[PDB]
Amino acid sequence: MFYINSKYKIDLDKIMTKMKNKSVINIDDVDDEELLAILYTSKQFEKILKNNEDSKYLENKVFCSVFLEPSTATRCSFDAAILKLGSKVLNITDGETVEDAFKILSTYVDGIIYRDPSKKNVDIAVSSSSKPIINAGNGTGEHPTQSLLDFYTIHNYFPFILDRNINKKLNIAFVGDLKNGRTVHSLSKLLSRYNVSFNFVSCKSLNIPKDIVNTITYNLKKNNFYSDDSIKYFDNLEEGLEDVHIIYMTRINAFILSNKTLENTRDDTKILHPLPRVNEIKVEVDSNPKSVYFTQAENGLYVRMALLYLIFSSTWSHPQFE
Amino acid sequence: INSKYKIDLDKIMTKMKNKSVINIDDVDDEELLAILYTSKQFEKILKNNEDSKYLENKVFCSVFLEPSTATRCSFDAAILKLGSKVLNITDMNSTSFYAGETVEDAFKILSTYVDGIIYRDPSKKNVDIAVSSSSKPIINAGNGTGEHPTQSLLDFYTIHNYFPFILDRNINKKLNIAFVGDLKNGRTVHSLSKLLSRYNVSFNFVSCKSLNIPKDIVNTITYNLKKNNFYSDDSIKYFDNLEEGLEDVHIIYMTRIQKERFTDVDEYNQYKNAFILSNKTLENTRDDTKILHPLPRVNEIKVEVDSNPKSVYFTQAENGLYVRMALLYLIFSST
Amino acid sequence: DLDKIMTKMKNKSVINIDDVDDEELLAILYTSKQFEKILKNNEDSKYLENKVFCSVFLEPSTATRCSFDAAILKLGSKVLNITDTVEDAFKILSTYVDGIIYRDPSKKNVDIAVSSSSKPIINAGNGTGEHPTQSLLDFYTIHNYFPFILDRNINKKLNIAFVGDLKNGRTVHSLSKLLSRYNVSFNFVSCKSLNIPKDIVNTITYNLKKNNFYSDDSIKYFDNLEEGLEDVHIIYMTRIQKERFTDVDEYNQYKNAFILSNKTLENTRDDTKILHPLPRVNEIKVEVDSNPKSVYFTQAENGLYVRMALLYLIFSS
């Protein structure tokens, strides 16, 4: 019965007026209050589904899911969140200019989920749609709903990320393709709002982009959590995994995670991966209790249900007992 | 009542139950008024955020054997907003989906699982085959270069919103329309022409030589104008260009020039830049003229014309939701 | 007793016809008929509301995929659809949904899915030739016209002819297995090197022995329909599968042999019923659709009733 709303002021009626028909393109489109609301509402959706209670808290809405690259987990997670909420979805998986398409699609539906391998088209579609857009994609750019469900996963094991206490600091290692990884970019930016330290593990051409480091550095400094130990760079997993609460692995033989290479990590460390994987994580880590990547994917349902509930409701009633 | 015209909705719904809508001539005058009446009611409902769920727990199969945004997404949305359910086919080859099995077999089977089928196929002929073996009603969402009757109905709803007198068949109140672009392959032009020719309407047909309206559509138009005493030698005029063609028309109907039907890009290129609509080329048009385009569009209409209060093509697209909800409700309700 | 059988069936995967025992078959056929009754009289059919399924189809099987989707929707549930490592794929996919309908031409991928899925899978066709819901609707179609296959009455024997490509005909193998559970005798009609496999005859002989229904008349082999079709309650025809012959010449001197006509039906029983799992390549001439012995489209119809029946039994509560 004690959720984060017994811990922080979460006026869920005010915040939902502010989120009514909000578009979510980038993780900076979600503020402190909006993040609190999503995390609280994600927890309610988790409790409702896990007790097999009625989840149809958004009946009679119609979304269009546009996915112009293969997805699976993310596409099927959104489709599933929509159906569980009692709403319907029509689907595209591939002349017409982007703006015409979103002008027409937005006359037929209440909201659009959009994935495009192009980084720019989502801005175009946001300016021609008469309806709110959720970024599911936008190649190499951002993945805001990934960030939120990663955060929710992290908050579940490490409640103190929310406390903003100078003395309770979360250390996270990102590993793999940091350059192209829109999951790293989104989550970096989000974490850097909190008392967090970052180890970036990769090989030279895949290093974290300069301007992500500038955003992390900016945001850390804004809350007085910036020091010369905030952002360390690493060649290998030996150095890179030491004293991290979180290991976050990414797609792309130089950074393969094994039960051997987890021996010298913290006891309380938790392994994330947005998925899919190839060789980055060996089977045998699935059976290590520090593997939580499958709970993470699961959380994607509660968090995308929450977001959809917060953006498009009170137009049933509420998983806001508020 | 449309203001002056009673529809007995009871009678006409009985007459529409399980009707297939393949060609615009499958729909008569009384049925058209029923469709226009019901369309305005679903419009009023969706615009006042009222309950639209008046055809619940029906199951449609939408079968699209060629690309579509507007048409396939309006139908899906009409189905969902009405409270029914839809399974989708989007194999972008007619020959994938059949793969060896005859059309009559494929529809005899598919028809046993669902209450109605929405059918689009680049082939003209297959829809007739589907219709003769389907055990459930079929709505044609487009049969190649043939026809596109739900485009007709939503066009005419649009035109009637702005020029209510097409319905009067008054000798003194004539609608003039310009059709511009691919008239030979415009399944959209073929359906709306035929339909419009039942009323007091004159036709400007603007195109290049090898895209001119088919001969046999000029026969249907002629016969239908004569039938009602609205035919003269000025009814149907053919035009090189937009100067001559757009003179004194209430409706400018632009079509997409089909790239996807042209063995030579320079054959396509010379013709896709032939009929481009700008605000300049709208300066010498009637104040009350309205622009329609079934969309999508490429070069045909310059972005500047969106901001013109003569442009209604976005309203036309929207109207298709209300008309497809209307057609589905009238054909598929029960008891 | 419905509720004993259900509890045993709740959260059951169905991959192989052998996964369904006699009492499960009884429940499936009793429920399929319940749904047929309901849909035929336009009564409310929404007896499995608010459940979410994923359909993964990794080959063209458009009827089957469409039947399952229609079953899910008519029941009052919702479905999301996938169209073209596997154990990762299914761990994830199965947290999002209540159930999966999987079809894969791979032998190897369906066993893997079942072991990584936290949710029941229903096989909709695979690489091992198993297609249990085809077998169950085939069996329901027979039971419509010959209620007695269930009775295991020594006095009431069903007789079935299987015809065409019995070698590659995976639906035949599956349905044989299921039919040999009962008092049934088998005419296998083909040319030699497209004969019913050795080791299917063997599972049939085993089952008929198990239930005291085997004799020297249990299994006959035939050259031609004249003889093949003599005193049989059921004619099950099959696609001669071009598909499975490298070189189209070997296929052509094998595709023309067994064509069902009204002429070749004159000298069958009055009650005989003609099934085909379809598509068909007019090895059944169109004239036979109008013969009241053709039931292949009612067979396709029954798939709705059987796939609804199954989903209901595996996923209620």
Encoded amino acid at B62, one letter? S
Superfamily (CATH) of domain C131-302: Aspartate/ornithine carbamoyltransferase (3.40.50.1370)
Spell out which residues of chain B touch residue A109, defining contact as CB-CB under 8 Å.
73, 77
Among the partner-chain residues B89, B114, B334, the one whose CB lies closest to the CB of C62 is B89
> Is the bond leading into A276 cis (omega within 30 degrees of zero)?
yes
Encoded amino acid at A55, one letter? S
| Residue C55 parent element (H or E) | strand C52-57
Q: Which residues contact B278 (CB under 8 A, 6 or more apart)?
A: B302, B304, B305
The residue in chain C having the minimum alpha-carbon distance to the alpha carbon of residue B58 is C74
Spell out which residues of chain A touch residue B321, defining contact as CB-CB under 8 Å.
107-108
The three-class DSSP label of residue C99 is strand
Nearest alpha-carbon partner for B100 in C296, A113, C282: C282
Q: Which residues pair with B253 in a beta bridge?
A: B179, B292
A4-143+298-313 architecture in CATH?
A: 3-Layer(aba) Sandwich (3.40)
Spell out which residues of chain C touch residue B59, defining contact as CB-CB under 8 Å.
70, 73-74
- Per-residue tokens: A118: 């192009």
Q: How many cross-chain Cβ pairs, A to B, lie less than 8 Å apart?
A: 49
A-proximal residues of C, 253-272, CB under 8 Å:
none
> Is the bond leading into A274 cis (omega within 30 degrees of zero)?
no
Whether residue B334 and residue C42 make contact (CB cut-off 8 A), yes or no, is yes
Pair C301, B112: CB distance under 8 Å: yes
Whether residue A72 and residue C52 make contact (CB cut-off 8 A), yes or no, is no
Whether residue B57 and residue C69 make contact (CB cut-off 8 A), yes or no, is no
B49–A contact, CB cutoff 8 A: yes
The CATH number given to A144-297 is 3.40.50.1370
B114–C contact, CB cutoff 8 A: yes
The CATH number given to B1-147+320-335 is 3.40.50.1370
The three-class DSSP label of residue B53 is coil
Cα(A244)–Cα(B249) distance, integer angstroms = 73
CA atoms within 13 A on the CB side of C63: 23
Q: Which residues contact B290 (CB under 8 A, 6 or more apart)?
A: B158, B159, B162, B163, B250, B251, B252, B310, B312
Pair B84, B56: CB distance under 8 Å: yes
DSSP B237-258: EEESSHHHHTTT-SEEEE----
Helix C86-96 to helix C108-116 angle (10° resolution) is 50
Answer yes or no: CATH 3.40.50.720 is held by domain B148-319.
Answer: no
Q: Is B196 exposed, middle or buried (0-12, 13-18, 19+ CB in 10 A)?
A: buried
Which residue of C96, C97, C102, C112 is the best one to mutate when testing the A interface, meaning the one whose CB has the most A CBs within 10 A?
C96
Nearest alpha-carbon partner for B185 in B282, B305, B73, B294: B294
Whether residue C60 and residue B96 make contact (CB cut-off 8 A), yes or no, is yes
- Residue B202 dihedral angles phi and psi, to the nearest 5°: -115, 150
Among the partner-chain residues C50, C83, C93, the one whose CB lies closest to the CB of A76 is C93
Q: Is A51 exposed, middle or buried (0-12, 13-18, 19+ CB in 10 A)?
A: exposed
Whether residue B69 and residue A107 make contact (CB cut-off 8 A), yes or no, is no
Instruction: Work out the minimum CA distance from B62 to partner chain C, whole angstroms.
Output: 11
Nearest alpha-carbon partner for A182 in A160, A164, A209: A209
- What CATH class has C1-130+303-317? alpha beta
- Per-residue tokens: C98: 């209540």
Q: Which residues contact A200 (CB under 8 A, 6 or more apart)?
A: A173, A174, A178, A207, A208, A231, A232, A233, A234
Q: Which residues pair with B62 in a beta bridge?
A: B88, B118
Tell me the domain boundaries of chain A.
Answer: 4-143+298-313, 144-297
Nearest alpha-carbon partner for A20 in A143, A147, A123, A111: A111
Pair B61, B118: CB distance under 8 Å: yes
Asked whether this chain's domains B1-147+320-335 and B148-319 adopt the same fold, the reply is yes
Spell out which residues of chain A touch residue C91, defining contact as CB-CB under 8 Å.
294, 297
Cα(C54)–Cα(A67) distance, integer angstroms = 17
Among the partner-chain residues B85, B91, B100, the one whose CB lies closest to the CB of C279 is B100
Pair C305, C32: CB distance under 8 Å: yes
